Amino acid sequence: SKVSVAPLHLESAKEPPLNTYKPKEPFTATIVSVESLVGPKAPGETCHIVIDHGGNVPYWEGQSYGVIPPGENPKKPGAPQNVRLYSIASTRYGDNFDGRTGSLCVRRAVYYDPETGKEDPSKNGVCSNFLCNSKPGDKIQLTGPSGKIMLLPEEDPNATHIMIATGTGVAPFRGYLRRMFMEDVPNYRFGGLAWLFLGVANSDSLLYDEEFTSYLKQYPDNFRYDKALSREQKNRSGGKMYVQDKIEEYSDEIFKLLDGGAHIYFCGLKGMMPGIQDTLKKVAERRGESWDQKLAQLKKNKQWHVEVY
Ligand SMILES: Cc1cc2nc3c(=O)[nH]c(=O)nc-3n(C[C@H](O)[C@H](O)[C@H](O)COP(=O)(O)OP(=O)(O)OC[C@H]3O[C@@H](n4cnc5c(N)ncnc54)[C@H](O)[C@@H]3O)c2cc1C
C-alpha cells in the first residue's frame, strides 16, 4: 500500500526547477538529521543527510543540490567557497512525505598519506566532511537545484529502467524507486520493469539495502535488484567483482531489454565507467554485435543516461 504524499501541487509544474537559488544568495536551509548508512567494515563513512528547505527549493527526481561549505575560498581571498553538487537521494516529497525536505547521500572524502597510512584531516574533503559532521539545527547554504541528465522519463509509465550505481551513485535511484513503488502519486503509476544494480566495497558498505530488498517482496514482477561487493566477491575472470561484472551475468536479458527500448542509467564516481564500457564491448562481441554501433544508437534514441563525477 503506497504512502500518502503531500502536497500534490508538486506535480503541476511542467518543467524542472533550475537555479532557483544562486551562489551569491543561497537559501539557508536547516539540517533535520545526519546518520551513517554503513557498518563497521566499510572502508569509509557515507552518511544520509535530511535538509529542511521549507518548500522553497523544490526539485524533480534526478536533480542535484549545491552546497556552499563555510569559510573563505582558499584560491580567492575574501570570496566564498565553491559550490559542491550532490545528487538528491529523495523524491520531490522527501523522506517526511511533505514536500519540505530533501536528502543527500554523502561519502566522506578523507586524506591518508599513501605510505604511512596516517590520516591528515587538513587534506580531507571540505564539503563532504562538513555535511557528515552536521547535526540537527545546523544551517546549510543551499543552491540550485540543477541538472537535467538524470530526470526520469515518465512519458511511458510502463518503460524499463536499468539503473547502474556505484557507491553514492545510488542516490537518484533511491528517488526514482520511491516514486515508482513507495509513494501514492496518482498521475504516475509505474507498471514497467525497474532493475537496480549496485556496486559497493562490501556488505557493510551497502546503502539503503533494506528499502530495495523490500521492493522485491512488494513488486516482484516490476523490480529486480543485483549487488556487487568488490572486496568480498570475485568475477568469473577473478578480478574484484564490479558492477559491470554483474551486468554480464544478465548479458542476454539486458541486451534484449535495450533493444526493446529500455533506458539505462549510470551514476557514481567516474572511475566506474571505463570498465563498464570494456564489459559491454566484450558482451557485444560475444553476441556478434558492435558495441560502438549499439552505443551510438542508444544515444541517438535517448536511452543512455550518465552522470558520473
Ligand atoms: C553532479 C554531481 C553529483 C554528485 N553527487 C554526489 C553524491 O551524491 N555524493 C557524494 O558524496 N558526492 C557527490 N558528488 C561529488 C561532490 O560534488 C564533491 O566533489 C565531493 O563530495 C568532494 O567534495 P569535498 O568538498 O568534500 O572535497 P574538496 O574539498 O573539493 O576536495 C577534493 C578532494 O581533494 C582532496 N584533497 C584536498 N586537499 C588535498 C591535498 N593537499 N592533497 C591531496 N588531496 C587533497 C580531498 O581529500 C578530496 O578527496 C557529485 C558531484 C557532481 C558533479
Numbering used by the authors: 1009 to 1317
Sentences from the paper on this structure:
FNR is a flavoenzyme that contains a noncovalently bound flavin adenine dinucleotide (FAD) as a prosthetic group. It catalyzes redox reactions between Fd and NAD(P)H. The redox-active component is the isoalloxazine ring of FAD, which undergoes transitions among three states: fully oxidized (FAD), semiquinone (; partially reduced) and hydroquinone (FADH2; fully reduced). In root plastids, which lack PS I, R-FNR reduces nonphotosynthetic Fd by oxidizing NADPH from the oxidative pentose phosphate pathway.
Previous X-ray structural studies of oxidized FNR have not accounted for the potential partial reduction caused by X-ray irradiation. To limit the reduction rate to less than 10%, it was necessary to keep the X-ray dose below 0.11 MGy. Consequently, X-ray diffraction data for wtFNRoxi crystals were collected using multiple irradiation points within a single crystal to minimize the dose. The absorbed dose during the diffraction experiment was calculated using RADDOSE-3D and estimated to be 0.097 MGy, meeting the required threshold. The X-ray structures of wild-type FNR in oxidized and reduced states were refined to 1.15 and 1.10 Å resolution, respectively, revealing no large structural changes in the main-chain backbones. The root-mean-square deviation (r.m.s.d.) of Cα atoms (residues 9–317) between wtFNRoxi and wtFNRred was 0.121 Å, indicating minimal structural differences at the backbone level. However, the Fo(wtFNRoxi) − Fo(wtFNRred) difference map revealed subtle but significant changes localized around the FAD/FADH2 moiety, highlighting the structural impact of FAD reduction.
